[PDB]
Scaffold this active site. Structure first.
Site, PDB file in Angstrom:
ATOM      1  N   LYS A  41      42.691-155.082 -99.418  1.00  0.00           N
ATOM      2  CA  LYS A  41      44.318-154.913 -99.965  1.00  0.00           C
ATOM      3  C   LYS A  41      44.528-156.154-100.277  1.00  0.00           C
ATOM      4  O   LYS A  41      45.718-156.384-101.048  1.00  0.00           O
ATOM      5  CB  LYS A  41      45.068-154.423 -98.454  1.00  0.00           C
ATOM      6  CG  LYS A  41      44.578-152.902 -98.380  1.00  0.00           C
ATOM      7  CD  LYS A  41      44.765-151.935 -99.449  1.00  0.00           C
ATOM      8  CE  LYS A  41      44.696-150.526 -99.052  1.00  0.00           C
ATOM      9  NZ  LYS A  41      43.478-150.144 -97.963  1.00  0.00           N
ATOM     10  N   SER A 272      35.622-147.710 -91.570  1.00  0.00           N
ATOM     11  CA  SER A 272      35.381-147.222 -93.148  1.00  0.00           C
ATOM     12  C   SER A 272      34.173-147.968 -93.861  1.00  0.00           C
ATOM     13  O   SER A 272      33.526-147.588 -94.526  1.00  0.00           O
ATOM     14  CB  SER A 272      36.568-147.396 -93.800  1.00  0.00           C
ATOM     15  OG  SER A 272      36.939-148.567 -93.915  1.00  0.00           O
TER      16      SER A 272
HETATM   17  C1  LIG Z   1      42.634-149.438 -98.444  1.00  0.00           C
HETATM   18  C2  LIG Z   1      41.255-149.166 -97.619  1.00  0.00           C
HETATM   19  C3  LIG Z   1      40.365-148.484 -98.119  1.00  0.00           C
HETATM   20  C4  LIG Z   1      40.395-147.351 -99.224  1.00  0.00           C
HETATM   21  O1  LIG Z   1      40.212-148.422-100.272  1.00  0.00           O
HETATM   22  P1  LIG Z   1      41.252-147.762-101.877  1.00  0.00           P
HETATM   23  O2  LIG Z   1      41.268-148.541-102.759  1.00  0.00           O
HETATM   24  O3  LIG Z   1      42.876-147.655-101.210  1.00  0.00           O
HETATM   25  O4  LIG Z   1      40.885-146.356-102.142  1.00  0.00           O
HETATM   26  C5  LIG Z   1      39.240-148.076 -97.071  1.00  0.00           C
HETATM   27  N1  LIG Z   1      38.958-148.807 -96.027  1.00  0.00           N
HETATM   28  C6  LIG Z   1      40.085-149.624 -95.330  1.00  0.00           C
HETATM   29  C7  LIG Z   1      39.932-150.364 -94.171  1.00  0.00           C
HETATM   30  C8  LIG Z   1      41.328-149.857 -96.406  1.00  0.00           C
HETATM   31  O5  LIG Z   1      42.282-150.595 -95.876  1.00  0.00           O
END
Ligand SMILES: *Cc1c(COP(=O)(O)O)cnc(C)c1O
Ligand SMILES: *Cc1c(COP(=O)(O)O)cnc(C)c1O
EC number: 2.5.1.47
Lengths: 315, 315
Positions: A41, A272
């Site tokens: 981010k 994630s």
């Molecule tokens: C933002 C985010 C994602 C997803 O990425 P995007 O480009 O928004 O699709 C995945 N994992 C985490 C921890 C995130 O902060």
């Protein structure tokens, strides 16, 4: 010389590391926690603000407001502090005290909303605030602001193409706002013309909203534990026609694979990050993927989730 | 292409950022949390292990042991996981459950020693273990192993010289093992011949062991809260003759300045990062320092100290 005028200018150029014990040796991981506020981010926090300055809608006097407490909140907070803007973040009062201390230390103003109302309540309050004086407040909207996928098309995509000398065959990305998947794919398939690239979206098996949408079925979201992805709807920043395959991952697969990344490769990783890698492992069970180079995005560091199931029962 | 074989190879090349609200605009901060396990120790974790491999004393079968739970323990743990070695860390049983979860996730074996015995107890246990079978165990010794200052002479120093085009006049470093101060100074005064560079050591006013030693007084250490520096003795890796000035900083000055870094500049910073910057502010009260370019090392990120006084009473 290379002296950065402020911290928002240090975003990007994250490393691409080969995974040696996980998979067949062809999974290449892009470590997005190597950023100024430590997550993918940081790039959109910087660009959405730089974009508002260029459009003339953001200037001294205008305050920022956004309904979020996750990595996007942390990213907006360090950029606002670095460039001199006031920032207000709205979120459910149930939010961790850990998270609130961090956001507050970066100087953000926290407006806590009704616990029972969840995210919708936070989003609600944010809109009331901006409506209260639309010349004084500016709402960024990470899920639909085009400045989000734009930075990935301009930095993340080019970094991947360059670091692999164009040898990337498969690109895997768990979807949250969808900006990473959209921007990187636009650059590789669009700008560089590699139309045979396989773009893979990853999502929670418990909230397979993207698979539903692609099959023309009804969108039926559900709760899950893979923080950062699976928002439960299709974001304006996700371009569905750029996707070649969708892979659903369970909470357990995500958590156990995130743990293998730390223990077997020494890469601090969030839930994630495990989900995206577990997707690469599944594709490698299919012989058509045997000799392909796979690039996977690792969004954040496990250190930011020390209080979650990620670390439960280690002793 | 630029594909790293393992995560230990991604160390360094951290950014130099100008501070705009803290100081007169000439303080340049080097952000060492932009490393694989997020602190300045990532560099020595990698180099002490690479050095042992090159000397032939570290090979499959040999396990590592070190008495530490701080940033060095986290750094040794990701490198051992990345390159396939077993690692045992000894520390007081009083150690945070937060820190233990993190170290365990990276695959380190934790041997907890008597709380009442403090660090000396941890160091004790580590030596018993290695003596138990000296062909099977290898103790690295961060405070005296020359591979520690060596990496700073080879990476950190050159990065600073290059990024400022040789325009650095003052170099400020809080001392822990002393490797950063020793290695960077050797490169700038020694290798590049800039003998009028002013090297400043920073330490806790409550344990001014370096000032004592330089004045030929007795070494009388004391407790303090600036985590990461002021070990209470003069490390073998600290070359006292390279120091031009020592500045003592109080717990309160360190904490409040670390907070200004986050709120006014948007740079996540630990307590020792505040201490180093507070030292630059003091020197700037003297007119002879008015037009000098000051480079300061920021060792780690505030996110790693969410449970300390750094974040106490934010609301
Ligand atoms: C933002 C985010 C994602 C997803 O990425 P995007 O480009 O928004 O699709 C995945 N994992 C985490 C921890 C995130 O902060
Ligand atoms: C290691 C460390 C230092 C001191 O650096 P050395 O090169 O060991 O002198 C300062 N702050 C923190 C947080 C550290 O971990």
């Amino acid at each position: 010389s290379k002296i950065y005028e402020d911290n928002s200018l240090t975003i990007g150029h994250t490393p691409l590391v080969r995974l040696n014990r996980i998979g067949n040796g062809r999974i290449l991981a892009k470590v997005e926690s190597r950023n100024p506020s430590f997550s993918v981010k940081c790039r959109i926090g910087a660009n959405m603000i730089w974009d508002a300055e260029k459009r003339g809608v953001l200037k001294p006097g205008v305050e920022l407001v956004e309904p979020t407490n996750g990595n996007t909140g942390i990213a907006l907070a360090y950029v606002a502090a670095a460039r001199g803007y006031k920032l207000t973040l709205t979120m459910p009062e149930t939010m961790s005290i850990e998270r609130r201390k961090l956001l507050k230390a970066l100087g953000a103003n926290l407006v806590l909303t009704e616990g029972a109302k969840g995210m919708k309540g936070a989003i609600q309050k944010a809109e009331e605030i901006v409506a209260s004086d639309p010349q004084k407040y500016l709402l960024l909207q990470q899920f639909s602001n085009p400045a989000n996928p734009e930075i990935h098309e301009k930095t993340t995509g080019p970094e991947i193409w360059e670091d692999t000398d164009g040898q990337v065959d498969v690109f895997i990305s768990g979807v949250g706002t969808g900006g990473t998947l959209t921007g990187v794919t636009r650059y590789i398939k669009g700008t560089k013309g590699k139309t045979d690239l396989i773009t893979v979206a990853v999502e929670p098996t418990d909230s397979p909203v993207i698979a539903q949408a692609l099959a023309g079925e009804e969108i039926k979201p559900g709760p899950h534990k893979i923080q950062g992805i699976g928002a439960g709807f299709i974001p304006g920043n996700l371009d569905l026609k750029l996707i070649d395959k969708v892979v659903g991952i369970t909470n357990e697969e995500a958590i156990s694979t995130a743990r293998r990344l730390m223990e077997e490769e020494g890469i601090l990783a969030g839930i994630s990050s495990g989900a995206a890698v577990a997707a690469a492992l599944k594709l490698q069970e299919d012989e058509s993927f045997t000799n392909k180079n796979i690039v996977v995005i690792l969004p954040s560091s496990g250190e930011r989730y020390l209080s979650t199931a990620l670390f439960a029962d280690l002793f």
